[PDB]
Amino acid sequence: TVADKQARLMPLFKHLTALTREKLPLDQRDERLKGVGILPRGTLFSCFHARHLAEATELYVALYGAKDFNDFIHLCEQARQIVNEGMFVYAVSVAVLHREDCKGITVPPIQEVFPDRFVPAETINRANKEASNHPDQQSIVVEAEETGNILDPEYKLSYFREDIGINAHHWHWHIVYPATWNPTVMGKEKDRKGELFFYMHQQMCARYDSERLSNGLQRMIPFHNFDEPLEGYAPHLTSLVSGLQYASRPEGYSIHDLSDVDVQDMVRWRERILDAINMHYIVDKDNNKIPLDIEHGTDILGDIIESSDESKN
Amino acid sequence: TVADKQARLMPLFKHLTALTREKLPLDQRDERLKGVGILPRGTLFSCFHARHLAEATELYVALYGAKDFNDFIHLCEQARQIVNEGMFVYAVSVAVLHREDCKGITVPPIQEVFPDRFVPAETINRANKEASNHPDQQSIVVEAEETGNILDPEYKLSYFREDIGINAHHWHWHIVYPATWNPTVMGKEKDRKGELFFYMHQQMCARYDSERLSNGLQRMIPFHNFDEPLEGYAPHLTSLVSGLQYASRPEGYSIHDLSDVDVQDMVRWRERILDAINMHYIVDKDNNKIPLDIEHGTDILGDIIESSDESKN
User: Which amino acid positions bind Cu cation 1, per UniProt (chains A, B)?
Assistant: First the structure.
C-alpha cells in the first residue's frame, strides 16, 4: 500500500551520515551507478556549483530511470552507500517529487533529517552531551534561545533569517525546480521555471525588506559592485556529518578568484546579460537571436541568469 | 658559389653599428625609402610594436622584390647604412630565409652577431677592457659565470632562461613566421602559422614548467590580472652599439598606460576574444561571421591573438 511505500522511503532518509562505508565489493556491477560517486562522502555538497549539480543530475536520472518503485528503492539503497550524502538527499528528493511510482509520498523532514542545519552548535552539542552524560530513557529538552550580548542590529532580523520554516521552504523550492532539470530526459517540462525562479527570489527579498522596515532599518542595498567588501556573518552551525562546521565570514575583504571561476568572468557575464536586455534579444548557441518577448522574456532571462540547463547559451 | 655568397653576406652584417653614418648628402636620394625614415639607428627595435613591424615589413618587401641576388646585395648594402640596425637584421634574415636565391645561405649566428645580448655586461666590458689593456695579438678568454649572492630562487632557473640556444631559437622562429607576413605580397603563405604560434609558445611554457618542478618550484601562474604588480628582473645586458642597456625592472608597481596604448584597451581585446570563443564565431571586417571550426579554429585564433596581419579583424 501507499503506507508501506511511505515506510520504505523514510528509511532511505535515515542515518544518512552513517550510511557511508560503501560495503560494495565492486561498482562495476552497478553500471547504472558508474556515473556517480565522484564527490566524496564527508565533503559538503553545493547546490550552486556546476560540477556538483552535474553529479546530482546524473543521480536523479538513474532514480527516474528506475523501472519500478521496488527497483527505485534498490538502487537508492545501494547508491546511498557510495555517493556523498548531501547529493543523495538532493537526488532522492527530486525523484520522490516527480516519479509517478512515488504517487504515495512525503519526504522526511529536512529540519528533522538534518537538525544541525536548523539549530545552533551549542544546542546540538548540548543534546548530544546530555545523551551521553546520563544514560537514561528519559527525554532531553534543550532551549536553543541562548543568552548573549546583542552587538549587531542585524541580529534583530534573525527571527526572519534564522526561521526554520523559511530555510526548509527554500530547500524544497529548489527541489521542485532543479537548475539541472533536463526536460528531454524527463520528458516533462517545468512550466515557467525561469520566471518562477525570478518571482520566488524576488518575493524573498521583498519580504525581507518589509522586515527591515518593520525593524526601522533601511531597505537592503544590492551587491552592485563586486569590489566592495562583504559584511561578516557567523552561522554557528556545526555540520553533524563532520566535526567541521560552516566557516564563518569575518569582516571586509574584496572578492577573490576561485580556481573554478574568476571575477572578470563574473562581471563580463553581468554586462552580457544587461546588454542583451537593452538589445532586446539574446543569442542562442546557434547564433540565432531570440527576442525578449513580453510573454517569454522573463522565463528566458531566468534560465540564463540562474542559470539552468535551459539557458539558451 | 653559394658559399662565396655566404662570405659576402656575413661581413655585410658584421659590426652593424659602424656601417651606419648614412653618408648620402640628400635625404631625397633614397625615394625607395620615402615611405619610411622614421626610426633612427641607435634606437632599440621592437619585435612586438606595430609601427616597428610595419617598417620592418616594408624593408623585407624591398628585399623580396629584388630582381636578383646581386640586386639583393646592393639594396641591402645601401639600405643598412640608413635604417635602424635591429630592423635591418630582422628584415634581411627574413629575406634570406624566404628568397629563392638564398639556399644554403645560413645567417651569421645571432649570438655571434650580437654577443652583448647573450652575455652579461661584465664579460662584455672585461673583454673589451682586456683588448685595450694590453695590445697584443694574443687571444682573450673571459669566463662569464661570475661570483655573487644569489638572493632570488628564480636564479636557479637561469640555466634555462638565460640559455643562449633558447634565446637564439626564439629569435629565429619569429623570423620564419613573421607577424607582418603578408601572403599576398609574397604570394606564398605560411601554413598554420597562427596555430604554430600557439604551439611553439605553449611548448616554451610547458618546458619552463618542467624546469620549475625539477627545481621543486610550483608551476608558473598566468598573468590574468592586469592590476597586479610585476616581479622585478634585472638583465645585466649592455648594448655596446651605444652606451645604453636594457632597463631593469624592480617589482611592485601596477600597470601604466603608454601613449601608444592604454591598459584598458588590452582588457577590452581580451573580453572581445573571449566572447568570440564563447559564441563560437569571430567577426570579420566585412562583419561576416566565421566559425571557429575544429580544423581552422586554432589558426584563426592564433592570428587574431598575436596578432598577425592575417587577423580577420
Answer: 170, 174, 201
CA atoms of A290 and A267, how far apart (whole Å): 23
Q: How far is B110 from chain A (nearest CA, A)?
A: 41
3-state helix, strand and coil shares in percent for chain A, rounded to the nearest 5? 50, 5, 45
CB neighbour class for A131 (10 Å; exposed up to 12, middle 13-18, buried from 19): exposed
Is residue A124 classed as helix, strand or coil in its secondary structure?
A: helix
How was it solved? Answer: cryo-EM
Q: Which residues of B touch A285 (CB under 8 A)?
A: 280
For residues B22, B27, B31, B37, the Cα torsion angle rounded to the nearest 10 degrees is: 70
Contacts of B278 in chain A (CB under 8 A): 313
CA-based nearest distance B140→chain A, Å = 54
Q: Which three cell numbers stand for residue A282?
A: 539574446
Cis peptide bond upstream of B307, omega within 30 = yes
Q: Does B279 touch chain A (CB under 8 A)?
A: yes
Q: How many CB atoms lie within 10 A of CB B149?
A: 6
Sequence letter at residue A116: D
Contact A262 B289 (CB under 8 A): no
Q: Can you say how many angstroms the Cα of residue B219 is from the centroid of all Cα atoms in its chain?
A: 26
- Partners of residue B281 on adjacent β-strands: B291
Using CA atoms, how far apart are residues B58 and B39, in angstroms rounded to an integer?
Answer: 13
Pair B212, B159: CB distance under 8 Å: no
Q: Which three cell numbers stand for residue A216?
A: 526601522
